[PDB]
Amino acid sequence: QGLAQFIKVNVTLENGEPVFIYTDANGQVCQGDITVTQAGTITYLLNDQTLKGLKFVGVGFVTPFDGIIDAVTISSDGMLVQLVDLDKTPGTTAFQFVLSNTANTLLVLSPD
């Protein structure tokens, strides 16, 4: 068995552009960072408050072959992405969320 961690991805608009605010299971603002100490999953739930019809399309990595995250799964409605982390390779990876929107055909990225 592993652990399952749950982060809410709140997206609001400020000065006409998206702002990503992560909340934890306590309702506290956080950075959306996770320390993994055994095999398990991380679940990100989208709360789109932008009116721009945001949907997750995946999770993007500049170093996708580093072995920190094993896999990404996505719900059919784009409201959830989950990461499988078997925590065999030690180290750190960074990623950005990738989203579609209904205002235009550009994909949306979290800044970090």
Binding site: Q31, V36, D85, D87, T89, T92, T93, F95, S110
Partner: peptide, 7 residues
């Protein structure tokens, strides 16, 4: 965000 793995 960042994931840190401690195995």
């Amino acid at each position: 965000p960042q994931i840190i793995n401690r195995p």
